[PDB]
Design a protein around this motif. Sequence first.
Motif, short mmCIF file in Angstrom:
data_model
loop_
_atom_site.label_atom_id
_atom_site.label_comp_id
_atom_site.label_asym_id
_atom_site.label_seq_id
_atom_site.Cartn_x
_atom_site.Cartn_y
_atom_site.Cartn_z
N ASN A 82 0.80 -1.22 0.00
CA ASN A 82 0.00 0.00 0.00
C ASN A 82 0.84 1.28 0.00
OD1 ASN A 82 -1.92 -1.97 0.26
ND2 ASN A 82 -2.60 -1.37 2.32
N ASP A 83 2.13 1.14 -0.28
CA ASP A 83 3.06 2.28 -0.39
C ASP A 83 2.60 3.39 -1.34
OD1 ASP A 83 3.35 1.11 -2.89
OD2 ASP A 83 5.28 0.16 -2.40
N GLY A 84 2.11 2.98 -2.50
CA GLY A 84 1.74 3.88 -3.57
C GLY A 84 2.68 3.62 -4.73
N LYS A 85 3.49 2.57 -4.59
CA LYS A 85 4.49 2.20 -5.58
C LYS A 85 4.48 0.69 -5.86
CE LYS A 85 7.58 6.01 -4.57
NZ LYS A 85 8.36 6.57 -5.71
N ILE A 86 5.08 0.28 -6.97
CA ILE A 86 5.15 -1.14 -7.30
C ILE A 86 6.58 -1.64 -7.43
CG2 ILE A 86 4.45 -2.97 -8.88
CD1 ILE A 86 2.12 -1.40 -9.71
N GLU A 87 6.93 -2.63 -6.61
CA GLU A 87 8.25 -3.23 -6.67
C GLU A 87 8.15 -4.58 -7.39
OE1 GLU A 87 11.03 -4.21 -3.23
OE2 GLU A 87 11.05 -2.02 -3.07
N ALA A 88 9.29 -5.14 -7.79
CA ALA A 88 9.30 -6.36 -8.60
C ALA A 88 8.67 -7.54 -7.86
CB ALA A 88 10.70 -6.70 -9.03
N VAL A 92 5.67 -10.14 -8.79
CA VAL A 92 5.82 -11.58 -8.63
C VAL A 92 4.71 -12.21 -7.77
CG1 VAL A 92 7.33 -13.42 -7.76
CG2 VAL A 92 8.34 -11.40 -8.84
N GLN A 93 4.35 -11.55 -6.66
CA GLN A 93 3.37 -12.11 -5.73
C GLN A 93 1.96 -11.92 -6.29
OE1 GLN A 93 0.78 -12.19 -3.61
NE2 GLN A 93 1.43 -13.73 -2.11
N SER A 94 1.72 -10.78 -6.93
CA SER A 94 0.41 -10.50 -7.50
C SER A 94 0.14 -11.47 -8.63
CB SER A 94 0.33 -9.06 -8.02
OG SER A 94 0.66 -8.12 -7.02
N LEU A 95 1.17 -11.78 -9.40
CA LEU A 95 1.03 -12.74 -10.48
C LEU A 95 0.88 -14.13 -9.89
CD1 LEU A 95 3.31 -11.71 -13.46
CD2 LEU A 95 0.83 -11.57 -13.16
N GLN A 96 1.53 -14.37 -8.76
CA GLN A 96 1.45 -15.68 -8.10
C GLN A 96 0.07 -15.96 -7.52
N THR A 97 -0.62 -14.91 -7.09
CA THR A 97 -1.99 -15.01 -6.60
C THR A 97 -2.95 -15.30 -7.75
OG1 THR A 97 -1.43 -13.36 -4.89
CG2 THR A 97 -3.76 -13.88 -5.18
N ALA A 107 10.37 -10.29 -13.99
CA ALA A 107 9.63 -9.24 -13.30
C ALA A 107 10.36 -7.92 -13.49
CB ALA A 107 9.48 -9.56 -11.83
N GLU A 108 11.68 -7.98 -13.41
CA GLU A 108 12.54 -6.82 -13.66
C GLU A 108 12.36 -6.33 -15.09
OE1 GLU A 108 16.47 -8.09 -12.77
OE2 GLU A 108 16.21 -8.00 -10.59
N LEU A 109 12.24 -7.27 -16.02
CA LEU A 109 12.02 -6.93 -17.42
C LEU A 109 10.69 -6.21 -17.60
CD1 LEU A 109 13.10 -10.29 -19.15
CD2 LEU A 109 14.47 -8.23 -18.93
N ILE A 110 9.66 -6.72 -16.92
CA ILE A 110 8.34 -6.10 -16.96
C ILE A 110 8.39 -4.68 -16.42
CG2 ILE A 110 6.00 -6.16 -16.03
CD1 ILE A 110 6.12 -9.18 -16.08
N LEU A 111 8.94 -4.51 -15.22
CA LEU A 111 9.04 -3.17 -14.63
C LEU A 111 9.78 -2.21 -15.53
CD1 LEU A 111 9.73 -3.41 -10.78
CD2 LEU A 111 7.70 -2.58 -11.97
N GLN A 112 10.88 -2.67 -16.13
CA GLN A 112 11.66 -1.79 -16.98
C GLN A 112 10.89 -1.42 -18.25
OE1 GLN A 112 14.23 -0.04 -16.37
NE2 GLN A 112 14.45 -0.98 -14.34
N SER A 113 10.10 -2.37 -18.77
CA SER A 113 9.29 -2.10 -19.96
C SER A 113 8.21 -1.06 -19.67
CB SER A 113 8.65 -3.40 -20.47
OG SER A 113 7.83 -3.99 -19.49
N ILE A 114 7.61 -1.17 -18.49
CA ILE A 114 6.57 -0.24 -18.04
C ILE A 114 7.16 1.12 -17.69
CG2 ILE A 114 4.95 0.29 -16.19
CD1 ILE A 114 5.20 -2.90 -18.20
#
Length: 154
Positions: A82-88, A92-97, A107-114
């Motif tokens: 609930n920080d207001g930010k998205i970390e790798a 990973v956990q959101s995708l795992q859910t 995940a790093e590739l995804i973040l960098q692409s975004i």
Amino acid sequence: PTRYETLFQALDRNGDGVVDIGELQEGLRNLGIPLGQDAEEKIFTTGDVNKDGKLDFEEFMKYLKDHEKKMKLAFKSLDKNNDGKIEASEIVQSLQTLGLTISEQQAELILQSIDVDGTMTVDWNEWRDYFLFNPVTDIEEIIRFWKHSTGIDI
Ligand SMILES: [Ca+2]
Ligand SMILES: [Ca+2]
Ligand SMILES: [Ca+2]
């Protein structure tokens, strides 16, 4: 940018009060916003409510506002701490859910692409700015877009 006047005036090249498909293409390409014609067309078709082949400012604004609520619920769906930010790890956990399992490096590739700026993590403003003209409606189509965008597994 939730009034969207600046964007609209930026797109309305001839200043007639509406945005035509040509103005959308030329404008998005001139603003360095990489978008395909079929997806631009998706935007236009969703937005052009009165179906006159034109986007007036209220259709434009409506589309962008609803799109931004969809994007905010997606963002908060990805935001665990609930920080207001998205970390790798959160990707990973959101995708795992969701039943999908992905490595930290992908995940790093995804973040960098975004990520369009140098922040290395993505807050609400960057998330919204990135998905501003991306016709994705929810997190699943965001995942489909990721799957094409990075050219990675799942
Ligand atoms: Ca125009
Ligand atoms: Ca219209
Ligand atoms: Ca985080």
